[PDB]
Amino acid sequence: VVAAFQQSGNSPMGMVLDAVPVIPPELRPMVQLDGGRFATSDLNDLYRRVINRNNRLKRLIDLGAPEIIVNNEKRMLQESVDALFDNGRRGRPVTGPGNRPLKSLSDLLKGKQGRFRQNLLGKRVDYSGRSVIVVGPQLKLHQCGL
Amino acid sequence: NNSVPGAPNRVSFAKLREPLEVPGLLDVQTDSFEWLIGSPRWRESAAERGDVNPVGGLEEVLYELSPIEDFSGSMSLSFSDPRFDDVKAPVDECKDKDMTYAAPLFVTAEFINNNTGEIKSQTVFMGDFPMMTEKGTFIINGTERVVVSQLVRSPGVYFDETIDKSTDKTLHSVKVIPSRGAWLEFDVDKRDTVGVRIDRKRRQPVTVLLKALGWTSEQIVERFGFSEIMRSTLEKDNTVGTDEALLDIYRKLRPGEPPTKESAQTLLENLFFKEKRYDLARVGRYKVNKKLGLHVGEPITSSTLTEEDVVATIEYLVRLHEGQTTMTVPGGVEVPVETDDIDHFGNRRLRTVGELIQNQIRVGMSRMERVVRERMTTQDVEAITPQTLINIRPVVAAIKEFFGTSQLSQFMDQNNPLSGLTHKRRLSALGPGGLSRERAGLEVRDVHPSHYGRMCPIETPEGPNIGLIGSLSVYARVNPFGFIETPYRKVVDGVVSDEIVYLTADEEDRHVVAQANSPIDADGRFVEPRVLVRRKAGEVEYVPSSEVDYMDVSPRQMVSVATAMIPFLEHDDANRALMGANMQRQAVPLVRSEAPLVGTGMELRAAIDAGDVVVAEESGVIEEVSADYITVMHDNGTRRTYRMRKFARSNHGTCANQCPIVDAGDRVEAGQVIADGPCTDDGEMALGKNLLVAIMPWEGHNYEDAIILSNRLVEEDVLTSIHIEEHEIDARDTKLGAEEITRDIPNISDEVLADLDERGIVRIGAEVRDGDILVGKVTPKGETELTPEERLLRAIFGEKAREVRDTSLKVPHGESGKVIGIRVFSREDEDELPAGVNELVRVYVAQKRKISDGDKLAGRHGNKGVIGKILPVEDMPFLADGTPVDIILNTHGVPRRMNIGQILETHLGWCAHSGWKVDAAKGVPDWAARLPDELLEAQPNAIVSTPVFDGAQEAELQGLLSCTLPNRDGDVLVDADGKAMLFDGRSGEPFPYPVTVGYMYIMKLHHLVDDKIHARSTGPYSMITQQPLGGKAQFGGQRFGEMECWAMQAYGAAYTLQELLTIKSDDTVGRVKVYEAIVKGENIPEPGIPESFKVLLKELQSLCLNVEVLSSDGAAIELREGEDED
Amino acid sequence: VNFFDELRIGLATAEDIRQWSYGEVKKPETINYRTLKPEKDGLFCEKIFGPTRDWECYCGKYKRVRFKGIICERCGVEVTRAKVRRERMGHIELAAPV
Amino acid sequence: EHSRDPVSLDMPVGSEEEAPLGDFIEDAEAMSAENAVIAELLHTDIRSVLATLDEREHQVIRLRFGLDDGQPRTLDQIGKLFGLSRERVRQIERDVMSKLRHGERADRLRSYA
Amino acid sequence: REVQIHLVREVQEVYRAQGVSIHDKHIEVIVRQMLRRVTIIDSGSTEFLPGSLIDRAEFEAENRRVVAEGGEPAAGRPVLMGITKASLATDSWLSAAS
């Protein structure tokens, strides 16, 4: 590991973050499906927890709360970032309304339903169609009846 | 002997008299529910079965729960005596109005007030309980739902054992499985550290737990002095002492807690003696008592495990490990010592509708009593009344969830009456509380010698759910505990007896079971000295006729309902019969139904019990009959009218009709069939037609399982079917305004709106096609941005703003046909619509589908096929009398598949159609000695029956084929071998050799071509992935998986693969450019970068992983790019 | 064109994350409950990620494509293609390293 | 309706090949190529047609409506700005609509309706 | 060579016994990719750590070149892998992700 970093293409400072990025809204859309019911991807929920807890800490550190308060808040912030990048990696995963674990940021790449596995499954092409087949003996070897 | 009066007398080849009539086929479903609600009929039936104090389902769930305390004993609540009320509305009303067939449930709760002493009791509404219609289907939310029985491991003790490989020493392990609680695996190891593993915790020697139970060292030694391994383990244990033992148990079970003696005792009692935390149902207690022979005489009580059972278990384990064959626990009778198998149907119980609902009610009551306990311990005590205590939200929520989401509450498939009947008889194995697909090892999907008479081995889904789904046999019955019984008739002394006794798997092993086909003298004496028998464990071997103890009832005992109506099933293979059974449930009802010429006796009973046909309740004379209703005048002077539905859409689309068969002024006896539902003729199931089959390869048009059909079937509506589609749209109030269905739509010609009525919904009888407007719906867009130029145009013409959009219901692509009927639910008239909607109209459009290329046909023997060609009538080969064969089947698929039964069916079909006259002047020919005396002469178009496993023999068919009556011209067409000389339809010269001909019963499966046709030049795309998809507006693309990608790579086709993935699937700018290039003459441009990759890159960067697409010179390429076309 | 000789994946230093971002997300709000429009400087802010509808500006002063590639003073939302909403990113600047 | 808690897109729907509900959502919008051409044609056509009309009337349309600065001026308000009366605006609009429906103006603007 | 004979003979025996037939080169194209790796004991003058599997292309030629300059040769002997390990060792991270 030390040699791996010794090549020094990237410093070890990357292991600790000072600013997390947010994916564009389209990849986590907020659509209003037919019926007046709003639908959102779990990424929005996880980001809200991170942003809200961070803002509270910014307010709380300015106020001047005792040491225990700030320490607890930073613990909440670290936990929220932990859940964002991987939910269920540690501890009991954050659950949804039906006790369903939220699909964290790394859950888009892992498992059967991930970007890499989905690429294996194949992409749904256009200009196509399917139908039943029936033997036709009046065709030549290089023909097919549509 | 026809039980139903108005039966069509079909002479049958049966040679063995059946002593027991088929039981009510759907009683598996109805009896369970009758037990649940404590109906009077169930209690009356339980009186005969031999139960002194039977208790209903609800009467048990809310009786055991009561009384509920308040942790102090100063307040207690008890409820009992549950009673129902008359259903709110009949089934038909709840089906038309999209209501839920239910009845309100009232229970009598009483509050005691231990401190003061005064009591208060009154009835408490508990909710509208979904009741079960007479046919065993729940009408939930307007859709007939059927809950399939479930197979689950029986709670009890299973003395499992395993053999070590490295040591070659036997390791036994008993595994107590309760209904709810902990596991007590007493496994023995090669180390001899026989130990407990409570909750799969770290193994601890059993001596520790036994001492923690308080057993003294002297008592243990004296009792177990006959077990060497027990003594060695006792002398090898390290921890000793009851207080030390329980503390160790407390630490092991809940480590990190204060190790106090009182705490350990609470855990011990809470784990073994608490009647709520640890519990096994009455069935579990019965199994444990029978296995260990403890309290055998005592009736089932005190469900919770008792310590005397645990010590008996440890004695059983050690005694088995010694090798003893029998053991006797003191205070109980002796029982055999042997290993046990789960798959054995003695250990797999059946939880019918009553059990499933009861558990859901139990969970609901468990939640309710939690709330009432909290309220009781917190609410005021002076003026507390049960109404304010009892809550009904959790119970109603629980029951609704079960019928709305549970995997065991499935949409009753109503393809035909047989499909409905078989669905009720299903025995699902997967689902909540049962083994999943992945966890289901291959060992459980196999057949077991205990399935004989309890669960059909032939019928089961061919897909992945193979072996996890079965079906009750014809005669199978479910005992109150849940074990599936099966009738047998005992033999007192080598002589068969009339009276029967129902035996379960456990009682079968001890006794000896004969076989039905074994010959028996008229007086019951066994003619043979030895008879084939089924011994304890799947072993069959001859035995002396005196040793036999039980005999089957009929040879058809092992086959399900679907499999029981495949003639000559005794000649097919298991694979084909399995496909034959699973395709009779896919047939589609035709316009006009014809009873099969050759079919088993199960045809009639299956139709009567399926509920499709209406059967007269009491004898009477029909005063007036009409196409809509028939009224029967009873003998008591009371009138009754049988309203029968016409052209009503089933669940799966096929239509349902009930055309009366009786005539005015005709006497009808009670129980007779009055009208024929779908797939029925004169009251006997008829899923298809009779077609004159010729078995020969014809010009390759029937190559490799394809089929060739005469044009007679298309033009004479032989195989024409009706299908009903339902389209529905609703008007909901939006933020901008209220949506309204109206005849006026923006900028549409009057011709497109010609067929719309005044209300704005197409008028009945209007022929629609793919795209026409069914419902004129306009939605408001008033509070929407308006372009400055656009509202200027509005003012210029004075044109109405007309912001309202037009989301008007339209026929999805591929649908057509008349509009049989429309229903409109309006909140203005208080029709109980869902919250947020005002107008809800559903339009039914009916299309009459004929048979064309691509449709699937199939016989009863699993001989599938697809209509390769439909030749004109003159092209079909015709018999010497000008009759053209109506279908042709390839002969290369008959012997290889090994379903010779269909050939036999064809032969007997022709003999039944032509009619025969056995030569009787010189006496009965030797081959006809066994034929019933009334089967020696049959008229043309006669109907015959060959019951499964007992029917026409090979000698009999050969005899009949040589005795068929001549044609009206005076010539016999088919020769003695069943072959006939056909004339070629095209060439016109006779085929060189004779060919087989006869009538085979051909159904019409529901895998029609019209459903399976898709095409997509361009259509709607997704939102997150930007890939093709469309809901019948454009059919949607076809997946191009990885395996197809490998094929393209193997060819070396690099350009074609790039197009299939980049230009026409994801590359958005590519898709637009290519469609503009194709429409014009320009060459298709070069593809771009797939949207899938860019999404992957922009989502890999979000995890704080710097990803760069380097180029030559090690310089990053800025993937972001923007160019404005035009 | 389509020359991507190799592909490198490396740890993203905090400086890199700021470079990618087109702005900072500072509020947890997602969308207004009446106008159904992304809220200012929120998790869907049009200023940071991009305009919602093609060649709109969040104010109306630049609803026409005649003004393109122009950032508006009233709102600061670049008037450009709507699909740019699928590629632009923002960052949450934490007050305590994680 | 406000009390409703929004559904999650990641929830599988009907166990349809473990496909999240978000997969089936139809974009069915953002046809930038179509929007640009229509916007260019219609806006340019109306501007040119208004230019062919009386220039003061072109200003009236801009102010009466707000083609440039929004704020559609009412009959009285625009009369105040131009010094005219509230009743003159109706006739002015009547003249504009009549002119717009004759000549090459109709040939250009017959579409877009 | 002998292990190559064994693997081809064993696989081909399985298929022929079952009825089907496929030409050998379709199997040799696999065992080639299965067998192109050399295990090492001691580095001595090679940067890569001992016990690390290195393919002939990288090992044999580079080690010979290092011998030319003066570095002591590393000891390597043929090793055989599986169709899984052979891919994992040399596949790129894109491919190995799935």
Ligand SMILES: [Zn+2]
């Ligand atoms: Zn602006």
